[PDB]
Amino acid sequence: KLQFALPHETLYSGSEVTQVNLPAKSGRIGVLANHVPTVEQLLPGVVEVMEGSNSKKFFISGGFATVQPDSQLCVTAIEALESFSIKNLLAEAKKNVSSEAAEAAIQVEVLENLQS
Amino acid sequence: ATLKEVEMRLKSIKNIEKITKTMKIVASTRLSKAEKAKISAKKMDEAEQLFYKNAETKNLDPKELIVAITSDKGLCGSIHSQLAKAVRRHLNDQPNADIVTIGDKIKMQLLRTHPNNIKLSINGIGKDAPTFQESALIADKLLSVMKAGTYPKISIFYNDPVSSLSFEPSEKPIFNAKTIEQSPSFGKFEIDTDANVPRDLFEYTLANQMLTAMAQGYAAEISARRNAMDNASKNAGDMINRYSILYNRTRQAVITNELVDIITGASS
Amino acid sequence: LTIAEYFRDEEGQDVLLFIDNIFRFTQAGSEVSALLGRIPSAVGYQPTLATDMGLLQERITTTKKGSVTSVQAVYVPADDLTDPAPATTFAHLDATTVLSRGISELGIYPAVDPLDSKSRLLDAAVVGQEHYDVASKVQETLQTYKSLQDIIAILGMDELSEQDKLTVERARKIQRFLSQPFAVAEVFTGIPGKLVRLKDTVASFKAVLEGKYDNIPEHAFYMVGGIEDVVAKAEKLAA
Amino acid sequence: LDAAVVGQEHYDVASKVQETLQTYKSLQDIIAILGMDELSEQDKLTVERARKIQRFLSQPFAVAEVFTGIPGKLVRLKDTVASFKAVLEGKYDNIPEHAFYMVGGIEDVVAKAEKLAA
Amino acid sequence: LTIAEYFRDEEGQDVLLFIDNIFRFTQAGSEVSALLGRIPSAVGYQPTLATDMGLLQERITTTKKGSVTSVQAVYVPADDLTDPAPATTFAHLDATTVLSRGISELGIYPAVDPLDSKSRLLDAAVVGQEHYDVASKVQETLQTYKSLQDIIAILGMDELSDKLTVERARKIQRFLSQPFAVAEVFTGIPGKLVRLKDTVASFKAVLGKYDNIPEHAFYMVGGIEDVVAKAEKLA
Amino acid sequence: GEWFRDNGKHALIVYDDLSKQAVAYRQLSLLLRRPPGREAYPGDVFYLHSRLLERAAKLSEKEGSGSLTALPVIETQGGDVSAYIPTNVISITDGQIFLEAELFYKGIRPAINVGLSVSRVGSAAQVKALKQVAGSLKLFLAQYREVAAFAQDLDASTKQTLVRGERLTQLLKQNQYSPLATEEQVPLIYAGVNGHLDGIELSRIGEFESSFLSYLKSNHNELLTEIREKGELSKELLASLKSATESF
Amino acid sequence: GEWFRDNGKHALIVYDDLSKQAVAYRQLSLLLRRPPGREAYPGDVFYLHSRLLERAAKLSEKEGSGSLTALPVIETQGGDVSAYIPTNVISITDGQIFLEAELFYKGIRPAINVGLSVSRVGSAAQVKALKQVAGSLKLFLAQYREVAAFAQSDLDASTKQTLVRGERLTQLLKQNQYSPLATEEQVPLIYAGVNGHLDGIELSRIGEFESSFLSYLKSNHNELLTEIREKGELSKELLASLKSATESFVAT
Amino acid sequence: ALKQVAGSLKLFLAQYREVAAFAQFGSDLDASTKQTLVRGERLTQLLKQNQYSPLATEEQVPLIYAGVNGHLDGIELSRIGEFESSFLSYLKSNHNELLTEIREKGELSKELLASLKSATESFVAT
Amino acid sequence: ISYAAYLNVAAQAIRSELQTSVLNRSQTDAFYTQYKNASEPTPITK
């Protein structure tokens, strides 16, 4: 049972899923059907949801994943697709604008794997 | 009485009649986004609170941070009226508290009743539908300039659309880093004691619960603005037509009196 | 008016008299009354406004032999109904027939307005409790249809509840079943004209009001004669 | 109506009644269209008090009782001044407005106020 | 009239005629009209109003002999522009400068209403294409206020999308004000006299380059060089 | 109508239309070069309606007690009761029954605006029986109109009367050519001031009238004869009223 | 002018202005001790203008087919159009053309209030080529004016486009004085508008678009204009070729 | 001396009149609107006067000065009326030399204006 | 810097033709203003 969520649109709502791959702060681990209740933060990556055998992949903004005792998954982020998804004016105007600015280095890490 | 004053007074009401009706459509056609962002937020709210439920998180055993959620735009009804009282009434029990106000029309009642309590206020937000970026930044300041992490209790005050014709002042709690890991059923979930999860969980639930509060808050408002201006266009009717008759009662009397002087001065 | 009198006093027919426009009868009266030197009355009309209008309109009545029915077009100065011109004229007027361009905009002929046009003889003690009850349900339903134009324009149509969507269907059809192909515009429309008699109209609508034709599409009502002409057109549209 | 003939207090009270009634008058339109909601608390209070002042100025007449049905009560000057002064200060900002309608002295308001409460 | 008339034809020179007040002319005709035994006209005026004004204004024209430049002051009864007195006068003037009681209450002097004062010299083939072009933009910016104002009284300048043009109304309207030396016992503010070309090039720049200084900086100042000296003394 | 007055009898004079008389009297005067006043009416248009409507009054005992009753009609324009003629007649007739088109369209008929309508001799001219069952009902509906306007926050107390006036005024909706006897009007008025018809829903509120009328034809014909002959309520029947109406 | 009508020829007469003739006749009647009417004007102040205007007409083929068209001018005070004289003339003319000061300063010239200005004859007396391209143009603006207020914040789709069209349609209706365009130069500019070939152009250069576009037609598509001028109707092949000529200029 | 204390009071009051047009719903005031609304409203009560109670020139000059220069803004709305008689007493006691100069000279000079500037601020506090 | 900020940046990256609503959440106008015993320090933007 998956429950993918976003502030503007809900994707899943108690729907039955076989396996979901969540990009935790550690490594992209696939959550089993009866996986142990854990609470780990999700860094921007790819979320694969397996409906039976069909493959669905979304690119995630970044939020929190939570396995409940009732083997229920709670995935949340700001904005989640792949068929709907170049910005390089940040490696100079942003990357070297060191004096929002001093921390303008998270931008590069996001887009690099977006192409992936 | 004046030849013109009753015509230009009929104008400043004839166009006020259409303007309240034109904003009624704006509020009624914007109810679509309101009844959507409301359900989307709530659904993420369940996904976000289910951990807080199965973990059995609750406030520890005199600081408390109060967040007021409304807009700067008026013409919406008693939404800025009843919510400000709900805050004031909740503030009475614990005068020892700091209040952050989102929107100016909420800063009104609070500047009157408890002027010193307000330590921070957000300006010019309530006009569109809320966004994460907006809230995440409000929480970023709430966290920085206000140091919310040093508070034992967080409370968000917002409006909850119970019905499509009536709203409802409500309150939700936000738990800090220390209150999360010290939860009774917190060990129930496997968590690596090093990656500051409880800390990141609070700073993240601080932004979301705001947006969830805003989403329903600015949804109950749009649903209340349509109501507020449907009664307005109707009330503008008992004016455009009331003074309309008074214009004619003056026009007929103008042509007659203007003609009497001519006939009187023609008899010689 | 004298011309129409003869076909009543001498042939006992139901003579029609058309006065267009009726307001210029009042206006011309003022000019004459003013030319003669008489003191202009209220708003500059002739002091003899009451009687002048009376002498004309009173000769439009139902005698023992026949009857003369006048259809007069009324101009309302500055859209003011308290003006001495209409206020006096309306006193004689029995019923009204409003031809709005808003109904014509929907491509409805004749472009009569169902909600504006009213009759002093729309009384159960004149047309019958039967005719009365049918007419009142027709108007009342269309009136709730005009109000729904609000939420329908933005929401769609799925907001209609059981009673809310069942009646709108009738409205969408009744508003189309009122239009009628005239036999005079035949050499312009091509469509042969059908004269729908009093007896039929009452029966035709009542049936639809009960809901015995909810199955028939909305197009089988546009520009049709009686109720029979709806059925024959319902089976010709299926082919 | 001068502080010399009716005393400074009578004039002060009467004046503070007029000052308030004009504020409610100059907003008859605002209220009639938008509503009290759109008016600030400053106005909110004054308006609410005026609505009570105007209805308390109402007084049944002995002769009118023939078709009115309500007994005509006569009020003397002294009571009048003190009464209206109290309402201005805010001593009765919690009593229903309908309690001021068609009554005599202030002591008659508390009478109708509670008889309508229960 | 007859006096200035002689300097036109018989003297062969440029004349300049000032009438004040011209309204008192028809007004005086009204007084006698009734007494002389005439059936009063609308608004109690005289039956001969368009011909009396005609047999007067017609003598104040430019001929082949000499030219006459007339500056007539017209009084408007009750500020009502529909009165037959101001009415008949309008049709005789090549240019106007309507004075309204509403513009002076803002502070701008003179009290010239920019939305009723129109000259027949406002032509591209007269003052120069540029002149006209700039003058048209100034007029566009203004009218919208009078109509869009209803939004400002109900909410203000927040719903303005148009938002850059709605604010130029409170800036251009102020810049129209010019100081005088004659009216020293009214403001005490030393007067300024701008010429033709200067005002043109001064407005085109504003129409929003000079959008940096809000409110005062264009208030009671000379050309454009004055605006720079009035923006320095921060107020 | 005066012959019946002078000869100790009774007459009801009804003028219609009085406004249409005024206009006609304005026609002659103008043709007679009489100076036009307000709305072009002569000065003595008040005198016309004054010396007319005063010929209607209850004579003295020694004079025979013959009474002439007048019911003048005035056709207003747009409800403008502040017009010259409309105001003139109201300054003569001690009482006004203003019918508002607003209420006519809604179905509330007669459309008598309680706010503007009043008879200058209530208890004096009203049957004592009706005087008891109508405890200042005029002042209740006059204030009730303030509830049906501002309410449109659900209340408890003041909103309670909203249900009262709703079915009370709807109960007053009398058709044309359907006169009722004094004894038939008295029970209805008592079923309102306390709200005895609160249970019935907005549909058959008028049906109860035809129902309760039948219940008196034979089941309760004893009551009808009492009020008809006396015309005054007693403590005896006052207690006998709270039971026969309690059954429904 | 009636001379031309009587001899099979056509004449157009402009009364500038009738408002002032009325005043004149008032001056005469008042001095001649004649009964005054509403606002001093004699009784037959209506019959004065009625006599005149009703003289203008298109004679039957029987006599000459000559026509006398009349464009009367009324100077209205403060916009009031319900006054005695104004409403009098209006109730005689076969249509009215209104000019507002509001639009005049706004930049719309000629400042025409289509909401009030309407011809009775209308379609019957219009070039068939123009009638085809601007049939809906009349309605478009009638709905654009009411939706114009929605400027003050978010647009859906149904009213998102309507705000796009009229915003440049009226900008195109702007026409400088002393510069009359032939019907052959009108239809191209009206076709681009109604059909929507200009919707995607910045208003700043819509004015100059009119010129450059007409010069492009006269030079390259001279034939397309000469068939409209001579035939006055738009054939299926012609109107189709019109679209191509338009979308060809939209690119360059 | 009356011309000094009232440079553009009239024109300001007329512009305070239009301010109350937007100030009716309860909108937050900016810098260009808050300053004038407070001073402009207190100048209203300041110019009120009682019948049969004419004030002299030397009595008006001070009262007006404290309003246009920027001193009466601090005072409470309800205490405006009392301030009139109170401020005049303080003058007729202490800086009474000032008042007799306004009447005789008739014109305020830099010398006197400087002194008045100091005197006013002295009474605003205590 | 906040965790909600570490996420905001990423949400801006996913703005990468057919991005309808989507543009309403891309930016916002915000002005925060501190307060004292009410008095208030200079209003800056977010």
From Swiss-Prot, chain C:
Q: Which residues carry this modification: Phosphoserine?
A: S104
User: Where in or outside the cell?
Assistant: Mitochondrion; Mitochondrion inner membrane
- The disulfides recorded in the entry are none
TM region positions: none
Name the source's superkingdom: Eukaryota
* Binding partners and assembly: F-type ATPases have 2 components, CF(1) - the catalytic core - and CF(0) - the membrane proton channel. CF(1) has five subunits: alpha(3), beta(3), gamma(1), delta(1), epsilon(1). CF(0) has three main subunits: a, b and c.
Q: What else is known?
A: Present with 164000 molecules/cell in log phase SD medium.
The record's function comment reads:
Mitochondrial membrane ATP synthase (F(1)F(0) ATP synthase or Complex V) produces ATP from ADP in the presence of a proton gradient across the membrane which is generated by electron transport complexes of the respiratory chain. F-type ATPases consist of two structural domains, F(1) - containing the extramembraneous catalytic core, and F(0) - containing the membrane proton channel, linked together by a central stalk and a peripheral stalk. During catalysis, ATP synthesis in the catalytic domain of F(1) is coupled via a rotary mechanism of the central stalk subunits to proton translocation.
What's this protein's family per the entry?
A: Belongs to the ATPase alpha/beta chains family.
Protein name per Swiss-Prot or TrEMBL: ATP synthase subunit beta, mitochondrial
Please give the organism.
Answer: Saccharomyces cerevisiae (strain ATCC 204508 / S288c)
Q: Which residues of the full protein are shown?
A: 270 to 508 of 511
UniProtKB/Swiss-Prot annotation, chain D:
Q: Please, which domain of life does this record's source organism belong to? A: Eukaryota
Q: Where in the cell is it found?
A: Mitochondrion; Mitochondrion inner membrane
Tell me, how does this one assemble?
F-type ATPases have 2 components, CF(1) - the catalytic core - and CF(0) - the membrane proton channel. CF(1) has five subunits: alpha(3), beta(3), gamma(1), delta(1), epsilon(1). CF(0) has three main subunits: a, b and c.
Family per similarity comment = Belongs to the ATPase alpha/beta chains family.
Q: What else does the entry mention about this protein? A: Present with 164000 molecules/cell in log phase SD medium.
Task: State the protein's purpose.
Answer: Mitochondrial membrane ATP synthase (F(1)F(0) ATP synthase or Complex V) produces ATP from ADP in the presence of a proton gradient across the membrane which is generated by electron transport complexes of the respiratory chain. F-type ATPases consist of two structural domains, F(1) - containing the extramembraneous catalytic core, and F(0) - containing the membrane proton channel, linked together by a central stalk and a peripheral stalk. During catalysis, ATP synthesis in the catalytic domain of F(1) is coupled via a rotary mechanism of the central stalk subunits to proton translocation.
Designated name of the protein: ATP synthase subunit beta, mitochondrial
Organism classification, top ranks?
Eukaryota, Fungi, Dikarya, Ascomycota, Saccharomycotina
Gene (UniProt): ATP2
UniProtKB/Swiss-Prot annotation, chain E:
Signal sequence span per UniProt?
none
* Cellular compartments annotated: Mitochondrion; Mitochondrion inner membrane
Residue numbers bearing the Phosphoserine modification? S104
Tell me which domain of life the UniProt entry assigns to the organism this sequence originates from: Eukaryota
User: What the protein does?
Assistant: Mitochondrial membrane ATP synthase (F(1)F(0) ATP synthase or Complex V) produces ATP from ADP in the presence of a proton gradient across the membrane which is generated by electron transport complexes of the respiratory chain. F-type ATPases consist of two structural domains, F(1) - containing the extramembraneous catalytic core, and F(0) - containing the membrane proton channel, linked together by a central stalk and a peripheral stalk. During catalysis, ATP synthesis in the catalytic domain of F(1) is coupled via a rotary mechanism of the central stalk subunits to proton translocation.
Hey, which family's this protein in?
A: Belongs to the ATPase alpha/beta chains family.
Q: Other comments?
A: Present with 164000 molecules/cell in log phase SD medium.
Assembly behavior: F-type ATPases have 2 components, CF(1) - the catalytic core - and CF(0) - the membrane proton channel. CF(1) has five subunits: alpha(3), beta(3), gamma(1), delta(1), epsilon(1). CF(0) has three main subunits: a, b and c.
User: What name does the UniProt record give this protein?
Assistant: ATP synthase subunit beta, mitochondrial
Organism listed in the record: Saccharomyces cerevisiae (strain ATCC 204508 / S288c)
From Swiss-Prot, chain I:
Asked if the Swiss-Prot or TrEMBL record annotates the protein with the keyword RNA-binding, the reply is: no
- Write out the function statement from the record: Mitochondrial membrane ATP synthase (F(1)F(0) ATP synthase or Complex V) produces ATP from ADP in the presence of a proton gradient across the membrane which is generated by electron transport complexes of the respiratory chain. F-type ATPases consist of two structural domains, F(1) - containing the extramembraneous catalytic core, and F(0) - containing the membrane proton channel, linked together by a central stalk and a peripheral stalk. During catalysis, ATP synthesis in the catalytic domain of F(1) is coupled via a rotary mechanism of the central stalk subunits to proton translocation.
Which BP terms from GO are recorded? proton motive force-driven ATP synthesis; proton motive force-driven mitochondrial ATP synthesis
A GO CC term assigned to this protein in UniProt: proton-transporting ATP synthase complex
Entry protein name: ATP synthase subunit epsilon, mitochondrial
Q: Which organism is it from?
A: Saccharomyces cerevisiae (strain ATCC 204508 / S288c) (Baker's yeast)
Lineage of source species: Eukaryota, Fungi, Dikarya, Ascomycota, Saccharomycotina
Assembly and partners?
F-type ATPases have 2 components, CF(1) - the catalytic core - and CF(0) - the membrane proton channel. CF(1) has five subunits: alpha(3), beta(3), gamma(1), delta(1), epsilon(1). CF(0) has three main subunits: a, b and c.
Q: What else is known?
A: Present with 4280 molecules/cell in log phase SD medium.
Q: Work out whether the entry's keyword set contains Mitochondrion.
A: yes
Name the SUPFAM superfamilies on file: Epsilon subunit of mitochondrial F1F0-ATP synthase
